[PDB]
Amino acid sequence: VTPVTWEDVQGARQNELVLNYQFRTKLNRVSFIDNYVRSVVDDGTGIVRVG
């Protein structure tokens, strides 16, 4: 995460750590990526659900 303006530096640092933490612990990063590419390559398009 990179800030857009000079006053957004604090926000970028806070969100980047939180966002990386969730994928590191709450999700299987390796398995998700493997299904991510293979779904797009085989079916021609990939659909991701966010909840």
Binding site: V1, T2, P3, V4, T5, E7, D8, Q10, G11, A12, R13, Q14, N15, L17, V18, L19, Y21, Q22, Y36, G46, V48, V50
Partner: protein, 51 residues
């Protein structure tokens, strides 16, 4: 690359609503910074890309 950016933007908006202040403080041992709720429509202050 853009597919992950789309997911990242949605999660950041969710993190600003469904996460309490103390939860972010524990994850990031820094001072908490808030964002206006009506400003979540536009990602004015953040940019998301893969590392």
């Amino acid at each position: 690359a853009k597919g992950m950016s789309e997911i990242g933007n949605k999660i950041i908006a969710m993190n600003a609503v469904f996460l309490a202040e103390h939860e972010v403080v524990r994850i990031t041992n820094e001072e908490f910074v808030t964002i206006k709720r009506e400003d979540l429509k536009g990602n004015f202050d953040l940019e998301v890309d893969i590392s």
